[PDB]
Design a protein around this motif. Structure first.
Motif, PDB file in Angstrom:
ATOM      1  N   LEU A 243      29.811  38.697 -57.166  1.00  0.00           N
ATOM      2  CA  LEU A 243      28.226  38.399 -56.915  1.00  0.00           C
ATOM      3  C   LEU A 243      27.467  38.585 -58.467  1.00  0.00           C
ATOM      4  O   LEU A 243      27.184  38.016 -59.270  1.00  0.00           O
ATOM      5  CB  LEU A 243      27.714  39.609 -56.031  1.00  0.00           C
ATOM      6  N   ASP A 247      25.963  35.405 -61.341  1.00  0.00           N
ATOM      7  CA  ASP A 247      24.529  35.495 -62.218  1.00  0.00           C
ATOM      8  C   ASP A 247      24.519  36.900 -63.174  1.00  0.00           C
ATOM      9  O   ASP A 247      24.842  37.635 -62.779  1.00  0.00           O
ATOM     10  CB  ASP A 247      24.724  35.426 -60.924  1.00  0.00           C
ATOM     11  N   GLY A 275      19.389  30.340 -59.469  1.00  0.00           N
ATOM     12  CA  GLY A 275      20.472  31.626 -60.142  1.00  0.00           C
ATOM     13  C   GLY A 275      21.553  31.251 -60.613  1.00  0.00           C
ATOM     14  O   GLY A 275      22.253  30.869 -61.328  1.00  0.00           O
TER      15      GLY A 275
ATOM     16  N   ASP E 123      10.341  36.374 -72.851  1.00  0.00           N
ATOM     17  CA  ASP E 123      10.812  35.302 -71.460  1.00  0.00           C
ATOM     18  C   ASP E 123      10.450  36.233 -69.990  1.00  0.00           C
ATOM     19  O   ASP E 123      10.769  35.853 -69.042  1.00  0.00           O
ATOM     20  CB  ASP E 123      12.162  35.135 -71.661  1.00  0.00           C
ATOM     21  N   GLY E 125       8.112  37.701 -68.818  1.00  0.00           N
ATOM     22  CA  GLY E 125       6.511  37.778 -68.360  1.00  0.00           C
ATOM     23  C   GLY E 125       6.626  38.266 -66.816  1.00  0.00           C
ATOM     24  O   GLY E 125       6.535  38.007 -66.683  1.00  0.00           O
ATOM     25  N   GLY E 166      16.186  38.301 -58.341  1.00  0.00           N
ATOM     26  CA  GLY E 166      15.465  37.480 -58.938  1.00  0.00           C
ATOM     27  C   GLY E 166      14.331  37.348 -59.853  1.00  0.00           C
ATOM     28  O   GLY E 166      13.525  36.968 -59.706  1.00  0.00           O
ATOM     29  N   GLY E 168      14.876  40.301 -63.126  1.00  0.00           N
ATOM     30  CA  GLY E 168      14.694  40.215 -63.982  1.00  0.00           C
ATOM     31  C   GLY E 168      15.377  41.772 -64.705  1.00  0.00           C
ATOM     32  O   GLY E 168      15.003  41.411 -65.832  1.00  0.00           O
ATOM     33  N   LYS E 169      15.940  42.329 -64.010  1.00  0.00           N
ATOM     34  CA  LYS E 169      17.014  43.351 -64.233  1.00  0.00           C
ATOM     35  C   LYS E 169      18.115  42.849 -65.425  1.00  0.00           C
ATOM     36  O   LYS E 169      18.188  42.404 -66.010  1.00  0.00           O
ATOM     37  CB  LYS E 169      17.254  43.792 -62.901  1.00  0.00           C
ATOM     38  N   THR E 170      18.757  41.099 -64.987  1.00  0.00           N
ATOM     39  CA  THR E 170      18.839  40.504 -65.927  1.00  0.00           C
ATOM     40  C   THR E 170      18.899  40.572 -66.937  1.00  0.00           C
ATOM     41  O   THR E 170      19.393  40.484 -68.022  1.00  0.00           O
ATOM     42  CB  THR E 170      19.494  39.368 -64.732  1.00  0.00           C
ATOM     43  N   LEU E 171      16.695  39.959 -66.953  1.00  0.00           N
ATOM     44  CA  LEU E 171      16.390  39.538 -68.045  1.00  0.00           C
ATOM     45  C   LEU E 171      16.248  40.674 -68.901  1.00  0.00           C
ATOM     46  O   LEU E 171      16.070  40.142 -69.976  1.00  0.00           O
ATOM     47  CB  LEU E 171      14.986  38.723 -67.439  1.00  0.00           C
ATOM     48  N   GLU E 223      25.535  46.375 -60.584  1.00  0.00           N
ATOM     49  CA  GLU E 223      25.702  46.407 -58.993  1.00  0.00           C
ATOM     50  C   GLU E 223      26.525  47.743 -59.242  1.00  0.00           C
ATOM     51  O   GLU E 223      28.168  47.776 -58.546  1.00  0.00           O
ATOM     52  CB  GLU E 223      26.276  45.117 -58.493  1.00  0.00           C
ATOM     53  N   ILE E 301       4.646  33.435 -66.001  1.00  0.00           N
ATOM     54  CA  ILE E 301       6.551  32.370 -66.103  1.00  0.00           C
ATOM     55  C   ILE E 301       6.924  30.429 -66.121  1.00  0.00           C
ATOM     56  O   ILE E 301       7.297  30.531 -66.310  1.00  0.00           O
ATOM     57  CB  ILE E 301       7.093  32.912 -64.921  1.00  0.00           C
ATOM     58  N   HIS E 305       8.385  28.909 -68.100  1.00  0.00           N
ATOM     59  CA  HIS E 305       9.572  27.577 -68.617  1.00  0.00           C
ATOM     60  C   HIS E 305       8.831  26.180 -68.410  1.00  0.00           C
ATOM     61  O   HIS E 305      10.184  25.184 -68.061  1.00  0.00           O
ATOM     62  CB  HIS E 305      10.371  27.472 -66.823  1.00  0.00           C
ATOM     63  N   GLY E 329      10.645  34.900 -59.645  1.00  0.00           N
ATOM     64  CA  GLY E 329      11.222  33.737 -61.057  1.00  0.00           C
ATOM     65  C   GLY E 329      12.112  32.740 -60.993  1.00  0.00           C
ATOM     66  O   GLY E 329      12.389  32.241 -61.702  1.00  0.00           O
TER      67      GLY E 329
HETATM   68  N1  LIG Z   1       9.600  36.959 -64.126  1.00  0.00           N
HETATM   69  C1  LIG Z   1      10.648  36.224 -64.583  1.00  0.00           C
HETATM   70  N2  LIG Z   1      10.483  35.147 -65.676  1.00  0.00           N
HETATM   71  C2  LIG Z   1      11.202  34.635 -66.429  1.00  0.00           C
HETATM   72  N3  LIG Z   1      12.271  34.168 -65.194  1.00  0.00           N
HETATM   73  C3  LIG Z   1      12.609  35.095 -64.161  1.00  0.00           C
HETATM   74  C4  LIG Z   1      11.859  36.578 -63.501  1.00  0.00           C
HETATM   75  N4  LIG Z   1      11.965  36.794 -62.911  1.00  0.00           N
HETATM   76  C5  LIG Z   1      12.839  36.045 -62.608  1.00  0.00           C
HETATM   77  N5  LIG Z   1      14.254  35.464 -63.323  1.00  0.00           N
HETATM   78  C6  LIG Z   1      15.391  34.187 -63.563  1.00  0.00           C
HETATM   79  O1  LIG Z   1      15.848  34.782 -62.272  1.00  0.00           O
HETATM   80  C7  LIG Z   1      16.884  35.017 -63.407  1.00  0.00           C
HETATM   81  C8  LIG Z   1      16.495  36.470 -63.220  1.00  0.00           C
HETATM   82  O2  LIG Z   1      18.292  37.402 -62.889  1.00  0.00           O
HETATM   83  P1  LIG Z   1      18.257  38.026 -61.908  1.00  0.00           P
HETATM   84  O3  LIG Z   1      18.257  37.096 -60.877  1.00  0.00           O
HETATM   85  O4  LIG Z   1      16.965  38.954 -61.727  1.00  0.00           O
HETATM   86  O5  LIG Z   1      19.424  39.011 -62.220  1.00  0.00           O
HETATM   87  P2  LIG Z   1      19.528  40.254 -60.829  1.00  0.00           P
HETATM   88  O6  LIG Z   1      17.608  40.560 -60.888  1.00  0.00           O
HETATM   89  O7  LIG Z   1      20.823  41.270 -61.350  1.00  0.00           O
HETATM   90  O8  LIG Z   1      19.003  39.739 -59.227  1.00  0.00           O
HETATM   91  P3  LIG Z   1      20.551  40.678 -58.413  1.00  0.00           P
HETATM   92  O9  LIG Z   1      21.917  40.047 -59.220  1.00  0.00           O
HETATM   93  O10 LIG Z   1      20.533  40.131 -56.995  1.00  0.00           O
HETATM   94  S1  LIG Z   1      20.481  42.285 -57.656  1.00  0.00           S
HETATM   95  C9  LIG Z   1      17.194  33.987 -64.373  1.00  0.00           C
HETATM   96  O11 LIG Z   1      17.440  33.137 -63.819  1.00  0.00           O
HETATM   97  C10 LIG Z   1      15.781  34.444 -65.108  1.00  0.00           C
HETATM   98  O12 LIG Z   1      15.624  33.580 -65.531  1.00  0.00           O
END
Ligand SMILES: Nc1ncnc2c1ncn2[C@@H]1O[C@H](COP(=O)(O)OP(=O)(O)OP(O)(O)=S)[C@@H](O)[C@H]1O
Lengths: 370, 54, 98, 156, 380
Positions: A243, A247, A275, E123, E125, E166, E168-171, E223, E301, E305, E329
């Motif tokens: 996981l 990503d 994603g 990015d 937002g 999905g 934005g924790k990654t973001l 994680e 968003i 994009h 997102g």
């Molecule tokens: N508010 C946002 N604006 C722009 N892109 C976003 C937004 N939210 C999510 N994304 C997109 O979604 C992905 C963000 O990473 P995430 O999928 O949120 O990872 P994550 O938050 O760790 O989720 P996990 O791993 O399942 S806990 C990227 O592809 C971003 O471009």
């Protein structure tokens, strides 16, 4: 009659493959090298022309580099050339081409190309514009400025051509292909899955742009073994490492990740979200018309009479596959060598038809339903 | 192991393993697979086959 | 008998050849030790450098002496791990259809 | 028989009849092009590596051809490092611009810069396409010769 | 005998061409420096147990061999040869030369980021509260200690994150790393999954020992479920190595002269199954979470994009944002890329809002309703 040219060209190929001083500065570099050029392993690199290495048993020295072979070749975690007399770093060794590469990195474009399909020509176009067009011709992403789609999922009935399309993308390729069967990700130890994940995708990320294909990934969620230590609280850790791997961070790279399943219902919703995977792709059993294309292709290189209509093999069974039609062809060949003929007639098709529909599709002993 | 006449492989009890030579003093039947054997210090070549002991 | 100091000559090392490399050079993993790119002699054969073959390696200069025979037998080792009942046709009588 | 004549008189000590005589190959075996990969790069008479470098040319240019441009891309003599981007970007008329920026990594002489420009120009048996590159085959010369370099008119 | 002939004698002509070529075949950069470096020295490195009093008399095990009483060479700094300090020792004389920084790990130095990804706050937002509070936590005290210390208040060392997958924790984590100005460190929560007992303790050790030397650094956990959920007790001995790794992470995280100047951002997708020892503050103060994009943050968003692509100017964004209440997102990104790909399916160069219609009415129908398949009414 073609055995002559076959054997002669094979022997010529082998002999020409087996067909493998002036420079004094090169010989002086040879003489700067020892006669017992020993081999070691790096730990760290210090800028002052020497670094720290490790021996076989664990002695460690500050030894310098013969500088005509570059130190930018040197990374932590490499095998080097060492001296005996001052143990100095002599040069770069070609790396351990580990059995992960020799097993997984398939050098070979396996079989027939996109002319080996049945019921396709949309999903081919999807996998084309999602993998090949990012690979071969990504000038359109200049023209607009948009990300390519990332992940691919192949799903449908067993025998649909997951295997066939996996061999098709590996046929037309210019990147390094990797293949994993999804049942491998449980071992007889505690915490061996994440190590496999990290080393697998590190080797995927180190060489080049690449394609990682994994198949039957559903065999990790709905499978238990007595050959398993820990268990679900290690399966979840394997899933969680993959996981974070898929990503995660740090500009993942031009590594198209393509997955293929039989069932779809028992899978993580956190792993089918985009994603990670942007192009989910349906494989239904497509139509009763391209049955004839698979009969055409799988009999394109075998002598057969006319003697049959494929409509007789259209109005027999309601679910259709290349696993149906290739089984029909092979069983027809078994009935052909059973009756020592060629130019396969109709009765071979009829007995092959009945014996293949019975073995196997019925369900279940009577009755039920009927 | 025995390569041939006047050349063999023995693993000494230093744990390591050596390409050595044998003497014509040894009767060649006392090699059968495995004998307690005698070696040298400097050159470390076979000198003698021992009776069953160890 | 005066020429028995041939037998008083220094010993040698048995090793493991992975595979050769360029400029007439080879590689040896010795008995417990790591890898050692060693030099070739004149009376030997680069065309007999086999994967995973013992060779006679000198100890002073690490020069190749001779090819050692009788390498490994790995499939024989797994076979002797098994010891399956070795068979032929004359003993599975009572049935010939299968 | 003239291909084994090619084998023997390929070893001639005069090394320009080697150049054109071995250069005939892309005319000869242009249809059965699977045999056209040869060991000319495995030879050492550097103009011979120039000859195979011609012999790829301009058609659609599969991965084996660009794989030969893996080694032919990396050479040090300015007429041969000059000689690679011309047929390299003729054979393809990132992907396309990836070996170009790789040539920017190669140099960053003036010839090489000119060669890079030629490669950029390339990036963006009919006899009319057969003549002007054999007219180009004496390139190691003055810009007065390169005043005619723009007369290899082989494209619509 | 057409294609047979063709393959056979063409490969034969090839082989015969190869046969006469198999028969026709028959530095100064630093060498003097190297001959000056044969008068250099081997310098074996070691480890120090302890010194003695009033005199050096250093007691050293190499790593493997034995233990020795040695004495330094006179070219040392006679002060900084302290205990546990890996130093280089002569072969013959056993004399010491220079201390060098110690063993870090074989593969734990390999998780410092060593680059900066171009994920920007612009990015991310639709989460302006999260943006400003994350700014306040991370960016302000580590670059501008202007208001905190000058009144005499502390900055929070700990911040947790979660939300919909999905969001934005990654973001946010990669978005700090554009403007980090700090030694950012990546930690997968599955890194503590080793074979051998108590190894994750050593992992936490070397994590914080990388954290202490270089100052003002970032460590990112990710994680943290695999790091452990709770402190389960049962008559079988299950989650133990994970459990001790978890508690050692708590201790060498904070307590008994704690961390110092490190900010740790933690993320998970299941925060409810976390032990209270992590949840109690001081360890982590601001429990900042993520919600779904409910409003024109969706349109922002869309603008993110869409600003990187040449589009039709005659379009709106709030209409499709109405058509995607629950969406993420990541799903927005999939729709925007998919509509761009629909435009690349065409031989145009500019998309339509109808390409966005294609992307919506293809993704949210084909791959939010066919997985799984309904074949039954029963409802409508
Ligand atoms: N508010 C946002 N604006 C722009 N892109 C976003 C937004 N939210 C999510 N994304 C997109 O979604 C992905 C963000 O990473 P995430 O999928 O949120 O990872 P994550 O938050 O760790 O989720 P996990 O791993 O399942 S806990 C990227 O592809 C971003 O471009």
């Amino acid at each position: 009659l073609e055995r002559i040219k076959d054997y002669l060209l094979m022997e010529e190929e082998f002999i020409r493959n087996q067909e493998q001083k002036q420079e004094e500065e090169r010989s002086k570099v040879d003489d700067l090298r020892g006669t017992p050029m020993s081999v070691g392993t790096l730990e760290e690199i210090i800028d002052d022309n020497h670094a720290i290495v490790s021996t076989s048993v664990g002695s460690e020295h500050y030894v310098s580099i013969l500088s005509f072979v570059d130190k930018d070749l040197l990374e932590p975690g490499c095998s080097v050339l060492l001296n005996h007399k001052v143990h100095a770093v002599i040069g770069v060794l070609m790396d351990d081409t580990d059995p992960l590469v020799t097993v997984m990195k398939v050098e070979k474009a396996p079989q027939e190309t996109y002319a080996d399909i049945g019921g396709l020509d949309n999903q081919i176009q999807e996998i084309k514009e999602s993998v090949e067009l990012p690979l071969t011709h990504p000038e359109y992403y200049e023209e607009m400025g948009i990300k390519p789609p990332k992940g691919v999922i192949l799903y449908g009935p067993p025998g649909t051509g997951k295997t066939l399309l996996a061999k098709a993308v590996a046929n037309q390729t210019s990147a390094t292909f990797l293949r994993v069967v999804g049942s491998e990700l449980i071992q007889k130890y505690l915490g061996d899955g994440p190590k496999l994940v990290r080393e697998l995708f590190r080797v995927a990320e180190e060489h080049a742009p690449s394609i990682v294909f994994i198949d039957e990934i559903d065999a990790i969620g709905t499978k238990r073994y007595d050959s398993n230590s820990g268990g679900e609280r290690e399966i979840q850790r394997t899933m969680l490492e993959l996981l974070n791997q898929l990503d995660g961070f740090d500009s993942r790279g031009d590594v198209k990740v393509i997955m293929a399943t039989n069932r779809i219902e028992t899978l993580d919703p956190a792993l089918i979200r985009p994603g990670r995977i942007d192009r989910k792709i349906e494989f239904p059993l497509p139509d009763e018309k391209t049955k004839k294309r698979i009969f055409q292709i799988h009999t394109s290189r075998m002598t057969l009479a006319d003697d049959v209509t494929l409509d007789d093999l259209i109005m027999a069974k309601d679910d259709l596959s290349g696993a149906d039609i290739k089984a029909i062809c092979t069983e027809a060949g078994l009935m052909a060598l059973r009756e020592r003929r060629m130019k396969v007639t109709n009765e071979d098709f009829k007995k092959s038809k009945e014996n293949v529909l019975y073995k196997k599709q019925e369900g279940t002993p009577e009755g039920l339903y009927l | 192991e025995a390569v041939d006449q006047n050349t063999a492989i023995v693993g000494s009890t230093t744990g390591s393993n050596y390409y050595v030579r044998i003497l014509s003093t040894i009767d060649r039947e006392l090699l059968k697979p495995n004998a307690s054997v005698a070696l040298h210090k400097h050159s470390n070549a076979l000198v003698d086959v021992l009776p069953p002991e160890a | 008998r005066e020429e028995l100091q041939l037998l008083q000559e220094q010993g040698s090392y048995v090793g493991e050849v992975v595979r050769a490399m360029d400029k007439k050079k080879v590689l040896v993993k010795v008995h417990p030790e790591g890898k050692f790119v060693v030099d070739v002699d004149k009376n030997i054969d680069i065309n007999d450098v086999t994967p995973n073959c013992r060779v006679a390696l000198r100890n002073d200069s690490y020069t190749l002496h001779k090819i050692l025979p009788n390498k490994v037998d790995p499939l024989v080792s797994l076979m002797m791990v098994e010891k399956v009942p070795d068979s032929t046709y004359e003993m599975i009588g009572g049935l010939d259809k299968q | 028989l003239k291909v084994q004549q090619l084998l023997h008189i390929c070893s001639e000590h005069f090394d320009s009849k080697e150049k054109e005589e071995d250069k005939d190959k892309k005319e000869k075996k242009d249809k059965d092009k699977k045999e056209a990969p040869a060991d000319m790069g495995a030879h050492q008479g550097v103009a011979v590596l120039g000859i195979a470098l011609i012999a790829m040319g301009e058609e659609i240019g599969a991965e084996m051809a660009l794989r030969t441009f893996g080694h032919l891309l990396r050479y040090g003599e300015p007429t041969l490092r000059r000689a690679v981007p011309l047929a390299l970007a003729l054979i393809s008329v990132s992907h396309d611009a990836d070996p170009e920026v790789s040539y920017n990594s190669i140099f960053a002489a003036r010839l090489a810069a000119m060669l890079r420009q030629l490669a950029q120009y390339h990036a963006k048996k009919g006899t009319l396409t057969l003549c002007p590159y054999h007219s180009d085959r004496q390139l190691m010369s003055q810009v007065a010769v390169a005043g005619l370099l723009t007369v290899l008119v082989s494209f619509l | 005998q057409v294609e047979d002939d063709i393959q056979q004698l063409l490969k034969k002509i090839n082989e015969l061409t190869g046969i006469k070529e198999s028969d026709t075949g028959l530095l100064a950069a630093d060498k003097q420096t190297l001959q000056s470096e044969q008068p250099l020295q081997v310098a074996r490195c070691t480890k120090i147990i302890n010194a003695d009093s009033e005199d050096p008399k250093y007691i050293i095990n190499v790593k493997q061999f034995a233990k020795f009483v040695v004495d330094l060479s006179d070219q040392v700094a006679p002060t900084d040869i302290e205990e546990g300090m890996r130093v280089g020792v002569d072969r013959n004389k056993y004399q010491i030369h220079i201390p060098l920084p110690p063993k870090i790990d074989p593969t734990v130095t390999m998780m410092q980021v060593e680059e900066k990804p171009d994920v920007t706050y612009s990015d991310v937002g639709g989460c302006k509260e999260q943006i400003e509070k994350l700014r306040e936590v991370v960016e302000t005290p580590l670059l501008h200690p202007e208001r905190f210390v000058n009144l005499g208040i502390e900055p929070p060392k700990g911040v947790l994150l979660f939300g919909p997958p999905g969001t934005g924790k990654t973001l946010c984590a990669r978005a700090v790393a554009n403007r980090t100005d700090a030694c950012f460190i990546r930690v997968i929560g599955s890194e503590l999954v080793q074979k051998y007992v108590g190894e994750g303790a050593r992992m936490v050790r070397e994590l914080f020992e990388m954290a202490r030397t270089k100052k003002a650094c970032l460590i990112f956990f990710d994680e943290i479920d695999a790091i452990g959920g709770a402190r389960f007790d049962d008559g079988a001995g299950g989650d133990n190595e994970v459990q001790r790794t978890m508690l050692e992470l708590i201790n060498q995280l904070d307590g008994f002269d704690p961390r110092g100047n490190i900010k740790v951002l933690m993320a998970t997708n299941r925060p409810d199954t976390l032990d209270p020892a992590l949840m109690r503050p001081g360890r982590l103060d601001r429990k900042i979470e993520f919600s779904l994009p409910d409003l024109e943050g969706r349109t922002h968003i869309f603008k993110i994009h869409a600003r990187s692509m040449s589009v039709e100017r005659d379009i709106r964004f709030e209409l499709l944002a109405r058509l995607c209440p629950n969406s993420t997102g990541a799903e927005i990104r999939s729709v925007c890329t998919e509509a761009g790909m629909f435009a690349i399916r065409a031989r145009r160069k500019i998309a339509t809002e109808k390409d966005f219609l294609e992307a919506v009415n293809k993704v949210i129908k084909s791959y939010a309703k066919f997985s799984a398949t309904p074949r039954y009414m029963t409802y409508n």
